[model samples]
Structure formats: C-alpha cells, structure tokens
Target: NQSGRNVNHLVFANTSYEILGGGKKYNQVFMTMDGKLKIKIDYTVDDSVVEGDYFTVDFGKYIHPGTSRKPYRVNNIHDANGRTIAIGSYDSATNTAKYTFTNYVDIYNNVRGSFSLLSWPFKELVTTDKQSVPVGITVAGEDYTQNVIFNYGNRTVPVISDINYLTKDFAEFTTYINQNRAFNTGSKVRLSGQGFKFTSPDEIEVYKVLNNSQFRDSFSPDYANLTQVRNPKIIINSDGSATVDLGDIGTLGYIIRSKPNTLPDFSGIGVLKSEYTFTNNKNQRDTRAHASSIQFVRAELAGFGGFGGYVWFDAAAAGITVNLLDPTGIRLATTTTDITGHYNFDNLTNGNYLVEFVMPEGYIPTDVVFENGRYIAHVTIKNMTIDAGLVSD
Candidate 1:
C-alpha cells in the first residue's frame, strides 16, 4: 500500500485591501476526486513555488466541503522602511477579503503575495511594542520564535489557529461548477483571486471593465530586496480581456465581446475543456460537470456576419479552421479554408463578427481585410468582407 505524507500550514499575511494598510489570515485542507468532488484552484506563484505552500487536510479527504479565502495577509511583506507592500481588504464581520491585481510585475510580485491581517497595528502605530498574543497552531505549538511573540504586543487580536477545513461557501461553489461541468476531471480546484471574479455563473468576473484605462501608479518591484522603485504610467486597455497573458495553467481566460449594447453580454474566449459521458467497468454510466473551470467564453464571438479572402503558404493554400463569433456556439457552425485556400460565407446579416483563425500545426497567420476583391476580382462581390491570409512557418 502506498501512503502520502499529509500536512498543512499558514505561511503569510497582509494588512490592507487596497494599500491604506491593514493585516489578516488564511487556512486549508486536502484532496482526491473519486468521491464525486469537483475541484478548482486560483493562485499566483511569485517565485515559481516548489512546495512553500500546501492546502492539506488534517482528516485528509475526510471533511466537509468548506473553502478558504486565504486571510489576505501573510508572508511578512514590507519594505526596509517598513512600508506596506500589499493592498487588499478584510471585513471581520463578513470574514471576507477583497482585492484585485492589475499588474503581476508590481503588486503580485511586491510581497511574495502572501495573505495576512497581521493589519491591526499599522506600520508606525506601535510605541510600546511587546508581542502578538500566543499565535498560530501546529502539532506542538504556534510561535514565530520560542518565548518570542508578535512585536505589536500580545494585546491586539489573539490567535485562533490550525483550521484544517475551508470556507462554507466551498460547498455551494463546487455544486455550481459541477452542475455546469466547470471542470471535467474534478469539481474542486484550489485558487486565489487577485482580479478574478465569482459573482455568479451568469457573471463570473475576469478583471477591469472593457475600456478599463491606462494611468499613473506607484510601484516597488524590488521590495523583496527593498525600495527599488518606479511609479510609472502603466498601459491598460478598456482593460485587457482573455486570449492573452495566461501566466499560468488553470488561470481562467475571458474576453469581453460585447459590442456597445449593439451586442449580447457574451465574451469571446476559447474552451479546450469538455465533458465526456461514459460507461464504466461496472456498467456505471455517469455524467460529470464543468462548474466554472470550463472554457467556452469565446463561443460568444460569432453568429451574425457575411464574410473572407484566401489562406496560403507561399502560394494559395488551406488548413486553417476559421471560427465565427456572435453565433449560438461552437457546435452550431464552422468554416475551414478549402484545399485551394479560398473560403467564403454569405447568406447572413451584418454585425461585428470576430473571426477566430484556428491555425494549422505549422502555420502562422496575418489578416488582410477587404470588401470583396483579392483572388476574385472579377466576381465583383457585394458587402461581404474578405478575411484570408496565412503563411506556413
């Protein structure tokens, strides 16, 4: 029989929700999906973590479906001047922490991004410093050092540690994702939200609004080393949407495809994840789910358009799978370049339809938009756009 070493712990803390400076906490449990549990995880690894963190369970996979918000502050983040490095919020009343990341290089990198509230005593509020009440728990005891305590004195918020389970909302979250196949492999995932959203299924958030802008902000990239500062004007699109960045795997992708109220609330994004209904060895036939871990957001890009030109290598060629946005969905329609490279579609109305060029194995593409011309000069087509051009790499 094979056995795994089970463990859990809290490694960091922050003091604020948005830089005004404050402090807070976090907790966790363990895994496996055969129990019909769906999984999902949100996180950001500043230095490509090896094993500095683990969301294990004391009872292993033997607990309720509770989740964790990762007490917004930890990691003892600050500057040599003791300047706070993380900005996030915590409502003790709601036990809720809220924060969003705009730049990974800045905020996400600034403090090793550990969650904390460790915000009660501001950077300079301490005068008669002593120790934080007896803190966090472990198999033996909880202390930053033997007989040593938090520098703020043991009078502030005392410690209630070693929480092996997660937030109660975790149960509902898993149910929601499974009902929709959010993740096919499992209904559970460990994740952190900097700018991610989970307001509801109909409104799972990505980041800033479309047209979210570029502005000036202060930054201290080397706080890990100290005050290597640069407050510059960072560029932000109507904030940027999905289909780009994706710094790590499991990081959900989203793109707003809304066309000025002249469109639906759908966003243009891709979905490489799916559900497969199958029968097992015991003749057990079952259907799994994809709660929010699914990727079909880009399916919202087609449906209304009269469109293309030609796809070629060095000459006229084909192999590119063209997708139309604004349509009903992926299973509804498809358009691929013919062997000769010229692919065309008509018999539709006019609207802002985003064309997705699903490139071939060893090919790259460049769009050459037109109002009917290119290889069919004599055809003298009407209002359809010519969307064709590809080169083999």
Candidate 2:
C-alpha cells in the first residue's frame, strides 16, 4: 500500500524486529535512520489462550522515501589504501558512466577501491557485466583500455586493472652488429648501419665519415661527407641492420696503381774535354805540304779527317812557320813545318780558332780547302787534318 505513496519499498538496514499476536491484535511500529526498526504490541483483551493459540505478524518491506529510478551518484573512487584517485559520473537511462582521474592512475600498481552509490535504491555497487564504462590511460600519445565493475549489490568486487596499461611504446639502440671488418683496394665492402630497434615507425640514414688512412692509429681527423663516391646506397633491413657500400675508389693509398707518373728526368752529364796535336808528314821540301799545310787548315777541320799529310820533292828543305790564332787574330800557338812539311799543335782548349801559314820565299799561296772555317768544339776532338797545295812561283 505504501508503494502507491510514491515511495520505494527497498529497505537497507542493519536490524529488524518481529512481533506475534494471540490475543493482542494491534501494535505500534517505529523506524530510525540509523538502520533500526522497533515494534510494540497492544493487548486488547487479557485473554490467555493456550500455547496452541497463535497469530501471525508480517513485517513487510521497509519503505524509503524516494523513487527507485533516481540516478546513483558515485561520490569518489579510491585506491585500496582509501586514497581518492578519481571521480565518477553516472547516467540512470543507460546505467553507464566514467571515472576520470586528475593524475595518472596505475591500475595494477595500486589496489582498486570498493565503489558506493548515494541514492534511494540503496545497494552496494559493482561493475556492470556489460562493462560499458572503460578506464582509460594515455602515455606519450598512446592510449590504453581497461574496464571497471559497477552494479547495485552489497557485495564488493575487484576491479580488473591490467598491469600493462601503464606501459609505453619505446625504441632501443644496440651495438654495431653487422659492420664490415676488413677492406681491400679495388673491391669495396658493404657495411650495416642498422643498430637500433623501435616499437613505432622510424627512419634512419647511413654515412661514411672517415677514410682508412684517416682512421689509422686513432679516430683523429674529423669526419667528412662521403660525396666522392657515386650513388651511395643506404638501406635499413627488416632484421634491424642497415646496408651501406663504400663504393668507388676516391681516397689515396686505397688505389695503389692509380698514382701519377714519376717526375721528369732532370739529371744530365757535364761537358767533357780532350787534348790532341796535329802532326806533319815526313816528306822533304814541298811547300804544298809545308807552309801550305797550316794556311788552309782551319781549326774547324779537326773533325773532318785524319791528322796526317804529304809533301812533294824539293831541292832544299826548309821549315814553314804556322800559327794558331783565336777569334781576335791573337796568336795562341806558333809552330814550323819541318823538312818533311810536318807540324804539330797539341793540347788545344775548346773554343774558336784560326790558322795562318807563312808563305815561303819561292812559293805563293794556292788552293785553300777548309771545312767549318771557325770550329766550335763542344766535347773534344782528338784527330784533326789540315792541307794546302802550293806550286813554285
């Protein structure tokens, strides 16, 4: 009957009282907000029936003031340690709501709390079986999902929070796993640039910084761009190592035979010199081979023929004077043709020279034959010839 009074008949209390009636038919009842209900029996007639005489007393559902359809308000969610971690909102129509925490909440790290609702249809709250409400977590732009229990019952249930909900996506860099060990001259080596693993999408680039000569002893000599090589290929493999090639020869000593030719030959031999003397023939008294010898014989004739001559028959034997002169006509050496019209000049220095022959008394200068009239000796000439033909005047 009290249900018609717009009141919910659900009673949530700690204690209830009961009364029985045999001769007593009326009673007074009392209820307290502290979860207590009291009953009083009123005796109408003092008639004591036997033990068999009995009456029934029914204590119906305790009526509470309010509608059962009213939405339940969740005050605050707490950790098992009773620390308030979040606040929740509820919806009566869908029986669904969410709890958002002011700070990050580690579901598994912290024990979950028992939920309580403040409303007329009082009952302990547990997570709904549908679990329409989700516990959300975000770490470094990544989101995680979990569900909490909510319902109307006095029993408290555990909140199934995942330990992994607080974990984050990451990347780790390892050592040089697939790098090249040894390298040679003409042939190239492929090296791995892959040294890292990532949980998310990422990009990497490989570069050759130093040459073998630059890398010897220590890591000195700062690294430079590898632009010298053509089409430098770098690729990251699925196995977490990068592929790179040290293609083409661009460094010194790396390509041994590729060096330039040796320097030009500048070493030269010095100028040389020699001494020689012109000799006269053993024929007697012939002016043709006598005085005429030195006249037409030029110093330049040294390289022309052998150092010898002849004289024809003559009555008297006489010496024909001959002289060697320099470019300025200064006499450098003087000699005379012997009876055999022979003469000699020795140990001549390298230079330009001239020959002069003194004409004999009965002879006049005749044919004169000379080659390279002015001789310029470069090295030395050991043999030289001179001749002149003369007839009696």
Candidate 3:
C-alpha cells in the first residue's frame, strides 16, 4: 500500500475527477498502509450546503482497504462544516469508487418559519395587534429558537398575530360547504341561535355566511379578508341551534374558527341545528320536503250554498281526519283539522291514503277535490293538497 502519497500522481492506468460549486479548488489524495484511499477537498465555495446535498468522488480503480477485493469503507472523514461521509461501492467495470457526506444541517437552524392566530368567525373583529398572543413552541424535535414568544407590553389588548391559517381554514370550510350543501336560486339556509359544536371540549364557531357565488369568489389559499355577510356571527349552542339574523337569506357557506390547538382537525366539527328554506320568486316557501318522497298533505275545507244559495266560506271548526294507509289498507298515521278547517299531515312516506271528513253537524260534504288534478288522495314526489266543499243539505 502506498501511504502518504498523492493519488493524482499514482501510476494508475487512468484517472478522472470533478468538483461542485464555483471556487478555487484544492485536492490531496493518499493511500494508507492498510490499502485505504482518502481524498481531501478544500474550496471557498460561494453557496450554503445543508442536509440532503451530496457530491461524489470516483477513483478509477477497484481498490480494497484490506485483503478482500472491495471498496474502502470511509471512516474518520472530516470537513469544516462537521459533515460525515459514507462510502459507496467500487465498480469493477468502470474501476471507480464513490463517497457521500451525511452531515447536511438545516439552513433555517430549527427556527420557526412563521405562525399565526385567526378568529373562528371571519371579520367579527378585524384581527389586529390587540389579539396577538404568544405561541409557545411545542413541536417535537424543535429547539428554543423555534418557540414563538408573543407579548402586548402596554396595549389594552394583546396583539393578535394576523396569520393566514384562518384564511386557509375558511377555504377548507367553504369547500366542504360546496360539496355538501345543495344550493338553488332563491333558496336560503338559516342559522339557528345556537352555534355549531365540536366533539372536543373546544368550540368550533361560525362567523360568517356566504352565498354560492360569494363563496366561490372569496376563497383564497392564503389568508385574506373574506367578503362575508356583515357581522354574521351567529351564536351556536351546544345543541347546534343558531338564529337566522342574516336578512333576505339565500343558499350559503359559512366561515368557522376552531378552538386554539384544535384547528386543522375538522373531523369533530359540524352544525347541530340548521334549516334550509327554499322559496320562489313570489316568496312562497317550497314544501316539497324530501327529494325522493312527498311528505306533506295540506287540506282546505269551504262551506257553500247557505241562505244565499251560493256563498263560499272558509269552513272553520270543521272536524277532518287523514289516514295514511299502506297498499294493504293498514293504517300508518292519522291527523286532524286545524282551527281554520285546514289540516296538514307532515312527514308521510310514499303510498296510498284515505282522507275521511267527519262532517260538521248541519254542514255536509258536497264535493271533494284534490289539487293538481287527482281523483283519489295519494302521495308521490309532490305534496297533496285536498279541498273539500260543503254546504247545508
């Protein structure tokens, strides 16, 4: 073995070399008495080296550190940056050897890149310096330098760091709304007085409501002010009920704030009480009730042909009953008339039904008419409205 000798000057058949980064290069090569080869690289490179960066060194010969014909295992490798080196294989065909360094330190030196705190409710109170609170570093494998310290030394309220996480959360929440909520023109969703709830002890709050168009236009990957309903902070109760204070409602998406240390975990977040009301241009509420079945039955009764022979009056205090029967004529549900002689049977399933009137004394059933041209009372995709005309016999 040639110890303490320059490898470049070795009597080898062929040799090649390469250097990374621009700088004046200095190189020295030696072979130890144990047949181990070593290379020293020194340079004034004009770039920062960190973890995952690597370079290679190739010796144009299959050299062994000991008796076995294998590449020398790198040991006691040294660099000014404290990087450690690992040896690569010796290629028999190319007759070359390689070495890699394992000491790439992080450029940021474990310092936290950035952080922020956002209101669960969008625009409830424009987050300013007052809400800034110190965030203690708690991430594993992090150093003190990464721990964020916050303070509002003399201000009335702690300065809240205006961060973009809220905006990100809003985007996620609106995306969920778009995926889950069915929206139609002139249809509105109402927020109950009680707010949304989380499965955890912390409260997941909604601060704003947006229509489909507004939600689509307001979403941003980065934190930014949302074009939300003005002061859309509806208090949600534990039961998930909320008030509908927002006026002239329409299909909507909501902005939410998760409790501190509880964000990004939306699995437990949901609305407990929400009502979706659909209306037409004339402001009449649509009572289709269900997508696959008609669940509402509305009935109106009128009295006609009194002493004047042709007088129609909204028959009040009339007794009426609606029997929901299956195809086998087995009774399923029963309801009575209301004060105005109008009756409604809600939450009915699709099937046939029998509507029987207990005629008020002296006023008899003169005629029975079902709305939308139906002779017999039945329910399908749309609600059934029955009008009964009666008079003294």
Per-candidate TM-scores read 0.19, 0.19, 0.21
Q: How close is candidate 2 to the true structure, as a TM-score?
A: 0.19
Model 2 residue 335 distance off true place after TM-score fit, in angstroms? 1.1
| Candidate 1 accuracy as TM-score | 0.19
lDDT of all predictions: 0.26, 0.27, 0.29
lDDT of 3 by residue, 294-360 (tens): 1111110011110001112334544455443333323334456555666655533232445544444
**Angstrom error at residue 363, model 1:** 2.0
Worst 10 residues of 1 by lDDT: 212-221
Model 3: ten consecutive residues of lowest lDDT: 300-309
Q: Report the number of the highest-lDDT candidate.
A: 3
**For model 1, how does the per-residue alpha-carbon lDDT over 1-393 read when each residue is reduced to its tens digit?**
211111112223221121111121101101111011112212233432222222221111111111222222222223334333322323333333323221222323423433322222211222123323222212101112112112211111101011111121221121111211121221122221212223222221122111101100000011132221132112222422111121221212111111011123433321111122333234454443231221122212223345666767657666666654332111112478888877766643333344555655665545233232212111222255555455556
**Model 2 RMSD in angstroms:** 62.9
**Residue by residue across 51-135, what tens digits does model 2's lDDT show?**
1111212211211111121212333344445444433344344343334342213223332233432212112121122222233
Candidates 2 and 3 compared by TM-score, better number: 3
Ranking by lDDT: 3, 2, 1
